[PDB]
Design a binder for these strands. Sequence first.
DNA 1: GAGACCGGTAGC
DNA 2: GCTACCGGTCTC
Length: 69
Amino acid sequence: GKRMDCPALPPGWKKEEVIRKSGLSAGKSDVYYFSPSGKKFRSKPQLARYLGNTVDLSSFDFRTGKMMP
DNA sequence: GAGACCGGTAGC
DNA sequence: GCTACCGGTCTC
């Protein structure tokens, strides 16, 4: 799966949260982003390198997908 | 203490 | 060869 749109980002970006199914950290979740091209990102720096100066992710909270002032 | 970040591998 | 997945440290 369920990639929801992410309005805090430019049009076409989707956010997906995945619950860990096994292991000691089973239950925890990993958050992933998807560019219009379909590229998978898993960290705010990855995302910053790919968008460059189009959007400031300093106030951007990676887990929720919202701009936190 | 919490979680962001990313490395290494198990499973395809 | 690729990649999803969980472990583990680093940063706060």
